Design a protein around this ligand. Sequence first.
Ligand code: IBC
Ligand code: IBC
Ligand code: CL
Ligand code: CL
Lengths: 254, 253
Amino acid sequence: RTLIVTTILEEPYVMYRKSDKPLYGNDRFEGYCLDLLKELSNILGFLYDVKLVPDGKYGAQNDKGEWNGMVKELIDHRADLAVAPLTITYVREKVIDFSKPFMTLGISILYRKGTPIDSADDLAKQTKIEYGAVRDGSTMTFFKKSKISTYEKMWAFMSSRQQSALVKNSDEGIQRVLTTDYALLMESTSIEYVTQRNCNLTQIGGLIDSKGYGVGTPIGSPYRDKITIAILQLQEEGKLHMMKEKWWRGNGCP
Amino acid sequence: RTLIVTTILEEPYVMYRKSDKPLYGNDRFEGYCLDLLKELSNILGFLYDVKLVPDGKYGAQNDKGEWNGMVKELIDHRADLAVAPLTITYVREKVIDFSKPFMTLGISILYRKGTPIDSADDLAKQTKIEYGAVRDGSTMTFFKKSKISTYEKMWAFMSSRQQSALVKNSDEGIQRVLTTDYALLMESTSIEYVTQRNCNLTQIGGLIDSKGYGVGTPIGSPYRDKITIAILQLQEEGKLHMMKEKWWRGNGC
Ligand SMILES: N[C@@H](CC1=CCCCc2onc(O)c21)C(=O)O
Ligand SMILES: N[C@@H](CC1=CCCCc2onc(O)c21)C(=O)O
Ligand SMILES: [Cl-]
Ligand SMILES: [Cl-]
């Protein structure tokens, strides 16, 4: 049978292809995750239909504890796999079976070049420069649930004033950084994509944590380990590396 | 219920404690992997006995397809867990169940400072400088099975003259790097440890690949997913980073 793969739009993992006519099915999309999905299907030998997550969300719980986003699609068995920049977190790993990481990364800071800010501590210990993250993503959740004093403070600043320091998505966060005196807490992978294309911005400090993106499957899924094994094979052959270079490719900056 | 944990001595993951009196049981060991094991037993609430792997090996296949080392202990159900610098690889993941990486790393180069050598390619195209890796480890295997031009060539060199360029273990590799004109391809985490303690040695280039160390368990183990979830919690709390900083920090160079 055909596997239903839930995903979400986000450059450069999943994007609408460009054509002079209307596109249909899997052909509507392209990006790192589509190349990954293609490699996985060739190795494990399965057909698949890509379907954008209806509510456009990654995955979190409501006050009742019920899930949404791609996580929910897997939990309800409306999707067999979730292929996207979906962070392997403690809370999510409890409700679905993640494959092993096909990409390793961490949270970092997106800000302007030629500045004296050099770390999260610098941001936390002042108030003139605003900073935040994408609402309901694994980055905001990191700050929300953190116990490390520096990060507890930064959270206080983020959730204050009805969370006005937070943005709805990466595109909005990036524009806010570009237009105002705002710093964006975002995953290193996405920051790298930006900095390579926009020399006016840079990453501040290093990674404040370590985590990975993994293919999601429903708990008990028989595809989880098979996918984990294909991912390890792809990494060992250098394919994951080639795929990353193919999609992050930019002129670079001085 | 006391779990049996197979491991292997390797600084600073698993080391004998220093005492003037004989040590017994788990008290004989100390290191990053033992602190991790303690954190894990505390979250999951299990008891455990640390036992060094009999043949002193990590885990590889021979031509008959038979496994040895820690991997074999798990396959044979002689250990409930494998906690050590055991690399999560394609061939091993097919015979045992790895938890999720509690440490991420990659293969890099250990060599002395002050030379023109800047990458693996610099080594592969030349022949005067010798280079190799610890025999039968995941690093050597990477080169042995690689189909990438540069690495294929480096393997051709490594396996030359009856593998004279390979060493039996990390300690031997380090001494060879310190004494002769030799470079040791070895996982970055170990290189970092060495360079913190040998101001004359350094890492050449970056990581040529990406992989992690995972807690090993027999296929179908009920503890694998539980360990995974505990590890993720440890990393999100910053405890894994603290543990690394604790055992890696040298004295200054
Ligand atoms: N990967 C995050 C969401 C996310 C996606 C894309 C851009 C990078 C990023 O930075 N913070 C996030 O929440 C994100 C998640 O799994 O919630
Ligand atoms: N982790 C490797 C073995 C290993 C152990 C310790 C030192 C670092 C290293 O570099 N190459 C290896 O094979 C090693 C493995 O699991 O085979
Ligand atoms: Cl639910
Ligand atoms: Cl896993």
